[PDB]
Structures are given as C-alpha cells and as structure tokens.
Paper text:
In Pectobacterium, iron acquisition via plant ferredoxin is mediated by the Ferredoxin uptake system (Fus), a molecular machine consisting of inner and outer membrane transporters and a periplasmically localised protease. Intriguingly, the outer membrane transporter from this system, a TonB-dependent transporter (TBDT) designated FusA, imports intact ferredoxin into the periplasm of the bacteria where it is processed by the M16 family protease FusC. To confirm the common architecture of these systems, we characterised the gene cluster analogous to the Fus from Escherichia coli: the ydd/pqqL operon. Furthermore, through structural and biochemical characterisation of the distantly related Fus homologues, YddB and PqqL from E. coli, we show that these proteins share key features with FusA and FusC, suggesting a conserved function.
In order to determine if FusA homologues possess the structural features required for protein import, we purified and characterised YddB, the FusA homologue from E. coli. YddB belongs to the outer membrane localised TBDT family and has been detected in the outer membrane and in outer membrane vesicles of E. coli in a number of studies. The structure of YddB was solved to a resolution of 2.4 Å by X-ray crystallography by molecular replacement. Based on identification of structural homologues using the Dali server, YddB is most similar to FusA with a RMSD of 2.2 Å and a Z-score of 42.2. As with FusA, YddB possesses a 22-stranded β-barrel fold, the pore of which is occluded by a globular N-terminal plug-domain. This fold is characteristic of the integral outer membrane TBDT family and like these proteins YddB possesses a hydrophobic transmembrane region. Comparison of the structure of YddB and FusA by dissection of their extracellular loops confirmed that the two proteins are structurally analogous; the eleven loops of these proteins share a common structure that is distinct from those of two other TBDTs, FhuE and Fiu. Substrate capture by TBDTs is mediated with an external binding site composed of these extracellular loops. The capture of the large ferredoxin substrate by FusA was shown to be mediated by a large open extracellular binding site. Analysis of the YddB structure revealed that it possesses an analogous binding site, with dimensions (27.8 × 29.2 Å) capable of accommodating a bulky protein substrate of similar dimensions to ferredoxin.
Author numbering: 29 to 175, 180 to 790
The structure:
Amino acid sequence: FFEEMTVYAPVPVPVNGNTHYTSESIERLPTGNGNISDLLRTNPAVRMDSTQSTSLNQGDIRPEKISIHGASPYQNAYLIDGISATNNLNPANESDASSATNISGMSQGYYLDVSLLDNVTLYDSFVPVEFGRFNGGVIDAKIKRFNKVKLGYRTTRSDWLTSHIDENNKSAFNQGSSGSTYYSPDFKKNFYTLSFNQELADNFGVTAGLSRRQSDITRADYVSNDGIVAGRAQYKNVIDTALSKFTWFASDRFTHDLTLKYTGSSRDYNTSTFPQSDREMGNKSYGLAWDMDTQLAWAKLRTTVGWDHISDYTRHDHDIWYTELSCTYGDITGRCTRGGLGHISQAVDNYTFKTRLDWQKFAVGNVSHQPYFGAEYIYSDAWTERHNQSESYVINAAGKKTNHTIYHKGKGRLGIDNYTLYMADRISWRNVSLMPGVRYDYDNYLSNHNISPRFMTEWDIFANQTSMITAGYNRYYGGNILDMGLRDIRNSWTESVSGNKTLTRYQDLKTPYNDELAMGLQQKIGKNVIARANYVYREAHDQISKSSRTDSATKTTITEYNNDGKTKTHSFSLSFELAEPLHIRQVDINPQIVFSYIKSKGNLSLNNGYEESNTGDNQVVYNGNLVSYDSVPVADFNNPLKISLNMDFTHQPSGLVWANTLAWQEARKARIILGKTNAQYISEYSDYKQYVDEKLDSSLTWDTRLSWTPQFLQQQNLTISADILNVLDSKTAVDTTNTGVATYASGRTFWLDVSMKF
Ligand SMILES: CCCCCCCCO[C@@H]1O[C@H](CO)[C@@H](O)[C@H](O)[C@H]1O
Ligand SMILES: CCCCCCCCO[C@@H]1O[C@H](CO)[C@@H](O)[C@H](O)[C@H]1O
Ligand SMILES: CCCCCCCCO[C@@H]1O[C@H](CO)[C@@H](O)[C@H](O)[C@H]1O
Ligand SMILES: CCCCCCCCO[C@@H]1O[C@H](CO)[C@@H](O)[C@H](O)[C@H]1O
Ligand SMILES: CCCCCCCCO[C@@H]1O[C@H](CO)[C@@H](O)[C@H](O)[C@H]1O
Ligand SMILES: CCCCCCCCO[C@@H]1O[C@H](CO)[C@@H](O)[C@H](O)[C@H]1O
Ligand SMILES: CCCCCCCCO[C@@H]1O[C@H](CO)[C@@H](O)[C@H](O)[C@H]1O
Ligand SMILES: [Mg+2]
Ligand SMILES: [Mg+2]
C-alpha cells in the first residue's frame, strides 16, 4: 500500500520500518547455527550482546539475544505465521545452573532452524495495529505453502574454530566449566535437514520441514579438589525442528491452512566437582493452527484457531543432592557432594482465537480508503511443576543427616484472559499515503486497559517515486512475565529449617511501553544508486524493575516489582545500494554500504530486564562525576557504531556464488562498580553508587560463504558450500573482569555444507 523502492542489495535492510528476509537471502548469507538471531545480526536496527556467544562457548547452538532500538531482549514479539510464539514465562533466567528451582529459558518460544522457513519478516518501527505485546520489535517466521525433496548436511567442529582465550581462563575452558558457567573446549556439530512439498490431491497439498541440529561438547566428567581431571564425556546439545503446513484451496470463497509446529531443545550437563550430577536441561514447544481465509465481495475475513504449548525443564538423573563428610563414592576420600535435585518444569498453553476483517478499497471524493479491523482472544494456561520429591542434606560417616531440606511434589497453575481490538485505515490522496490506527489490549494478569495509537504517513515528494519521506508516531505496550505469579508456588514446595520463602508483589504494575518517533527517507541518487536513511527515536517508559526485603518473623523475602526503569534511545541508519549490479567478464558484483548508529541512555541494564534493582538510584557517580542515572549510557547491547561493506559475486558459467560481509563494529564499554578501596573512588559521594566505563576493542569482521552448484548435473540438484566466519581472525575483547581478564569474540571458523534437490 505504501510506495517502496525494493531492496536489490546483498543484505536486507529496513524499508518503512520492516525488513524482509527471503529463503534465497537466508541461504546466501552465512548464518552459523541458523537461528533467527544469526539472520538479524546484520540488521541496522538490531544490537546483540557481544559477551553472549564468545570464543569460550561456540558449542552451544541455541538462539541468542537481540535488542531492537534500545529495547531489552525479553521485549520482542516472536511469531510463527502471525501467531504468538514468545516464551513469557521467565525469559531473563538463562542460567545453566542446577538447583531445586533453576530452569533455563529465553524469549524465543521455538528455537526454529531458519533454513526451513519460507521467509522471516522483522518489524522494527512503524509497526501496524495487528502486532502488539512488545517494546522493541516483531519477528514473524513464515511457513512455506506447497508449490521437490531437499536433503541438507551442515557441519563444523572445535578444530575448525580459532579460540582467543586469556591464560586465566585456560584451565576452566579445558575442564569445560567454572561452577555453573559451561564452556565448549571440544565439540562436533552435525546438522541434518529434510524439506519437501507434495500436492496430495486437487488444490490440496502439504510442506514438511525437519531439522536436527546436534553439537556434541566434550568436557571433564569429574574434576578433583586438586584440579585433576579424571575422565572426559560427550554432552549432547540437540535442537530438533518439525514444521508442516497443509493448504486446501477449497473454492474462490474459502482457503484453509493447517499448521503443525514443534521445536525440541535438549542439553546434557553435569557438575564436574559433584559425582552423579548428570542433568538434562531443555525446552519443548509444539502447536497447531487452523487458518481460514474467506473472500467476500465487500471484505476479506481471516480467522485463526490456535493452540501452543511452550515449556522449559530441568530433569536431573538423581533426586537427592547431598554432602558426605566422609565420601563413599569410588575412591574419593574427603568431603564430597553427590547427586541431583529431580525434575521441575514451567509451561504456558495459549488458546488463540483471532479475526481480521479487510474492507474493500473505496473513495470519498479524491481520498482513497481501505480500512481493517481485528478482534483477538487468547486464553493462557501457565504452570510450574515439581515432578518428584527431592531432598538435600549433609550426612556424617555414622549416617547422621543434618541441614536437611525437602522439595515437595507440587504444581501451581494460572489462568489468564487476553483480549485485543484494533482498527486502521489506509488513506491515500494523490502523492500522500496516511495510515491512522488504534490498538486496544486488556488482560486479567495485571488488569490494565492499554490504548496504542499507531500512525505512519508517507509522502512521494515529486510523485515520480525518486524521493519518498515517511514519518510517524506509535506506542508499543509490552507483554507479561508469568514468573511473578508462579514463583511463590514453586518456592513454597521447599521445606527447610532456615529457608526464606517468597512473596511477590506485581499486580499493581503498569504495562511497560515504548513511545516512538521515526523518520525515513528513500532516495534515488543518479541513475543507479538507492540511498536509505532512517532515524528512530524510542522513549522506554514504565520499565519493570524491583526492590526487595527479607522479614525475619515471617521468614519471607518480599519482592515488590515497580515501573521505575526508563531509557531514551536515538537510532540512525544510512544505507547505499545499486539498482543494477556491475558485470565484469560475466562476474556480477552487487555492492552495499550500511551505517548503523544506536545510542541509548537509561537507569537500567537490558540483560537484567525486570530483575533490575538499581532504578531507585536517582543519581550516580559516572566517570568521576555526580550525574542523573537516566543520563548515563546503557551498559549492555552497547556497540553504538556499525559500518558494513557487503559484496556478492556471482559467476553463473561456473555455478559459483560468493557472498561477503565486511562489518566494522565500535568497541563496547565494560561497566565496573567501584569499591571504597578503588583509586578512582570519591569518598565525598560515598552515599551514591559509583561506576567507571572501560572502552574495549573494535572489531573488523569478514564473514564469507562460497557456494558451488556443479553445472554438469542436469536440474542443478547438488550444491557444496563453505562458510568462513571472521576470515581475518580478528582478536576482539568483548568483555573484561575487574582484575582485567578479557573474554574474546570467536576467531576464524569454517562451516562445510552439502544440499541435494530431487
Ligand atoms: C569447508 C571447511 C574446510 C575446513 C578446512 C580445515 C580448517 C582448518 O581450521 C584451522 O586448522 C588449524 C590447524 O588444524 C587450526 O590451528 C585453526 O585454529 C583452524 O581454524
Ligand atoms: C526421517 C528422518 C529425518 C532426519 C534424518 C537424519 C537423522 C540423523 O540422526 C543422527 O544420526 C547419527 C548417525 O551417525 C547418529 O549418531 C545421531 O545420534 C543421530 O541423531
Ligand atoms: C487438513 C485439510 C483437511 C481437508 C481435507 C482435504 C480435502 C481435499 O479435497 C479435495 O478438494 C478438491 C477441490 O478443492 C477436489 O477436486 C479433490 O477431489 C478433493 O480431494
Ligand atoms: C475472536 C474473539 C474476539 C474476542 C472475544 C471477546 C470476549 C469478551 O468477553 C467478555 O470479556 C470481559 C472481560 O474479561 C468479561 O468481563 C465478560 O464477562 C466477557 O463476556
Ligand atoms: C481467567 C478466568 C477465565 C478462564 C477461561 C475459561 C474458559 C473460557 O471462558 C472465557 O471467559 C472469559 C471471561 O473472563 C470470556 O471473555 C471468554 O469469552 C470465555 O471464553
Ligand atoms: C471484544 C473485546 C471485548 C473485551 C474487552 C475487555 C474488557 C475488559 O473490561 C474489564 O473487565 C474486567 C473483568 O475481567 C473488569 O474487572 C473491569 O472492570 C472491566 O473494565
Ligand atoms: C532521516 C533522518 C532524520 C534526522 C532527525 C534529526 C536528528 C536527530 O538527532 C538527535 O536529536 C536529538 C534532539 O534532542 C538529540 O537529543 C540527539 O542527541 C540527536 O542525535
Ligand atoms: Mg580451536
Ligand atoms: Mg493491576
């Protein structure tokens, strides 16, 4: 509806607030593990946490965190075919640790292998009324409709990866861990894909995508008090993906779709120091969706009936975790800790009922109107469970148990009703396009009536589509964190002597939101250059943070959640591309320059999210100065300037495609909290928290993918590809400890993949 200059460049970029990633572009770009986060790292609206996936943990194949326009990584709406696929149970808890209540999770409900998706669409700004419950952006994964059998093999290993490690981390890295932080010294990645589409009957068919991504990380199974490794074992990390879509083109009026979705993540861990501490930590999501499109003469009606199960779990091998003062395990003699703390889980089931009505285009004088309305109902069943009774204790040689704790078999469930109403009008007069809209959200979890005004306007300045300006104002209200209401039930299962149970105060919370002011320019320079300039301003208000206290008499820790967090972020992007690529001796060259600049100031850390507790600090000492906390730069997802030269080489006679991305990223600042002993500390300001920012290293990263399709074979069935990540083997310090011990980004990495079509 809005006029747009299509992206012919190597890397997709934001057009009118949205970026489209086709399967061609997902396959052409080197995407590592093939998680949606690998696809979106190149987007100028996105910032990753460079301290997350480092030289120390390339074995892990799970999806990574993404910040859109300064928003936190738990504030994005992840959807599959327009249906919510976001894990709102407790996305901030990523800890791989073992405990009675620890469960590792993230915001992505399904860890989807992107190589099976038809396309992925990211909305970063000018987001329409249909999308909601997010503070930063919307990621919409789309499933292919029948239109072919493809087999794909992809592999990599620790031998093909260069690890830049500080000498201080060498021992922990070789063992495979340091307490609850796990490393991947030795690993082998085998990824298998199977995709097919088959017409089953007249106007009826199905598409099925299956993917098994496995990483076998080798660590020490047992480490002694001395630090002596006794043996090594293989810890299976696997993500299974199963996607399927049935389409029945029943008639001119009706079209039916039935979608089956399933992602199975499973990771084996153990505590090196504790014998018999094996545990399976995982995440399982599956669901169904019946879509129906009814075409009438005056309007189009789209209905969706859906069910999704999103879960995370910890399943120890053992049910008892205990400390023997005189060890009876194997040949261990001293004090030893053995076992595990059973099986726990957390889940949310959504029952979705959506409707959208698209009225036919009509005129009121010379002003063209195309309105649309939506109504949605989502029932959420959210729960946490302790599957088996567990115990902990210290036992003496005689058999006397002390410091005994019992974890009781239990389950706690929550029922939530979510409603959505929305309407927008597509207004078009001459060279001006207008889309005014309003979205309404209500839930009985926080019981807040949320009104989101949504407005974007586009002006074709000369009406020849050479200069187009887009401006807009939009409000984005986020979703809920179900842990707040569920944790107390999980903490009540604990029966111990001096254990503080929890009381969580959250029902008076206002829903967190972003106000956005955005301006976009699409400009044709000369005959062959397309230039895109975008500015996005985001004010993040009523951001969730907390404060706590422990009460002795009642033996309770009272956490009171609040809306004290606030950030201001300025986002700028400048892109240059060619309408026509160069042609030299049959080699087609497609070049692109992308500038991305994101500066954010706030009184919180994005990684902390709703668990942030320092928002009550109105003032801080920052780099020797007593300043307002809101004026201080945000400490994470903080590499402000990004400059990229992207270049695709295509030589059809030889069946070769050469994709290259050269990315220069600005150094991030590592925040350090100063103690009274610190040389830079100021006693004058002792009543305030004091921080110093240490700038680290900038990174020049060259990622490449060389794809060969042997021309001798009829139908071009076979394709062999090589991916090289960080070709220059840049050594970049992503993070540093208080002592000065540095964490490094990953070094040169080689990926080999084969695909056969039939
Ligand atoms: C398509 C994938 C081709 C892989 C070719 C082998 C990659 C070699 O990889 C290199 O090997 C060196 C010696 O073993 C190591 O020192 C380097 O760290 C490693 O990057
Ligand atoms: C219909 C089945 C579709 C997927 C086919 C690929 C499954 C690969 O499966 C893998 O095979 C390996 C064989 O060496 C085993 O060692 C692994 O444990 C297994 O996960
Ligand atoms: C998961 C989908 C459930 C619906 C069952 C599939 C019905 C397919 O029905 C098909 O419809 C065609 C007309 O559209 C006819 O020409 C075919 O003979 C008939 O098999
Ligand atoms: C596609 C389905 C469209 C949305 C259906 C809206 C149903 C509204 O239902 C109403 O919700 C109120 C709020 O909890 C309740 O107080 C009322 O008792 C209930 O009937
Ligand atoms: C949170 C308490 C109700 C849980 C849902 C139970 C089964 C569906 O009952 C729902 O009740 C709502 C009223 O609250 C209505 O708005 C819905 O239309 C109705 O489907
Ligand atoms: C078509 C969509 C209809 C649903 C709109 C949401 C109406 C929310 O309405 C609210 O319902 C609560 C009960 O759950 C009451 O406590 C509130 O007083 C009432 O304002
Ligand atoms: C398509 C490009 C649009 C350019 C928009 C104007 C430049 C925005 O610039 C911003 O202005 C703010 C004003 O208070 C300052 O606070 C920011 O530091 C500054 O970066
Ligand atoms: Mg290596
Ligand atoms: Mg309330």
